[PDB]
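Q: Okay, next protein. This is Evolved Cytochrome P450 variant (22A3) from Bacillus megaterium. I've checked the sequence twice, so it should be correct. Can you predict the 3D structure?
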Amino acid sequence: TIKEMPQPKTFGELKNLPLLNTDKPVQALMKIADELGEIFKFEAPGRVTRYISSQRLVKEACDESRFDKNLSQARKFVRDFAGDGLATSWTHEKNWKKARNILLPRLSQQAMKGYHAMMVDIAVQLVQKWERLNSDEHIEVPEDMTRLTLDTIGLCGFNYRINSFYRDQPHPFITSMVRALDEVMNKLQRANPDDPAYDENKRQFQEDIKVMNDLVDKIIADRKADDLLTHMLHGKDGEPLDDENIRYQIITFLIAGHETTSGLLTFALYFLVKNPHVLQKAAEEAARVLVDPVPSYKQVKQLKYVGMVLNEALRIWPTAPAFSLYAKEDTMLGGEYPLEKGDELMVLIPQLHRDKTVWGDDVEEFRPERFENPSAIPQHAFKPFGNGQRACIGQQFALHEATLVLGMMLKHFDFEDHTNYELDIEETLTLKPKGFVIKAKSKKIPLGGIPS
Ligand code: HEM
């Protein structure tokens, strides 16, 4: 009762690779897996991957006795600029689990009691910039969501003030990060990599890894002249971290610790303007809960419905959209698809969150009240933060940051979807709505003990 594995139209020496000559590869890999089922094979020269989309199979892949963690084929390149160091190392690494058990305890729920104040500091900045737009003026959502999420990691994680809001044009580091990823992403759709046709391109990329390093120089310099870098320097295990691997860990968290989080907020706010009854309902929760000008740690933990709106928007659109895995031994999967040792499966997350056998037929509706009883979401049907001993380390940081902010936004403004924005999701590894803009009617509620 073995079953042959599916596969998209191959085109020659290229195999299936030319089905990814598009700038929305994930979005297209869910049209493929949309037809070819819960699993389908994917060959591009000298690399093969299986794509699992059903909870039925994901729940096996996450069985850590069968499967270990893997580097996306995107990850080995984003390793040409990150780890050895957490988000781009294999479990079989030394400056992984040492590099993780220095930081893990700094990222718990309890550790957020400490970051909370600086998180509220950057949040106030974003709210007030909106209080001070002219009439005609609209909001660039993903654009301002980045201003925040980045400032906030820089500041909680590295006690450095990036002052992203004191700048009309996206911070250098972000313009360069974006252009560094689009490369990694196209250098993946490139049929002949080592070519001179791509030559102005791997020198561009280097200029960009310099701008990004600039800001990293600036953050260490500022420290010399209990943050997340106070350990990344003086945290033992039993080895503190070394010369070279620390400027890695830094660029690693400046990226991981904001991008995916900016994604989640643009998406949530999108979904809310399109479902104005959910906006209304979280807008009340926020009014009812945040009764001081600024929120307390205590208060942010009681934005229950807002936590829910975040998870729902994370179901419908995981911003870190896929994670990889390898087989630890030869094995059946599903009892049908037989894998060798080392074979690679990719967890197409946005599709797993659309598995109707686990969710309903309304998998495409925005309904935050699914997450009322979170004991109702089945084993493994939901994983925006990866799975297992390599779950997203910064999940509790992300969710607190994101609730706090979505919570304040909804306390001080009504938003109008003024352009009838039709969704367009730019892909730079991670997903984020592109050119999403709205207007905000302020509720004229004072903040900080400051009027406007
Ligand atoms: C906001 C602060 C965040 C930080 C500092 C952060 C950092 C990290 C780190 C260090 C890892 C690797 C952990 C490990 O290997 O032990 C990771 C993995 C991951 N993160 Fe995050 N992250 C953040 C937010 C988010 C958000 C909002 C999402 C939403 C989808 C997300 C999605 C993921 C996913 C899917 C992985 C899986 C990697 C894999 O297992 O292959 N992250 N993150």
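A: Here is a summary of the prediction. The longest strand covers residues 47-52. The radius of gyration is 22 Å.
Q: Noted. On to the next one.
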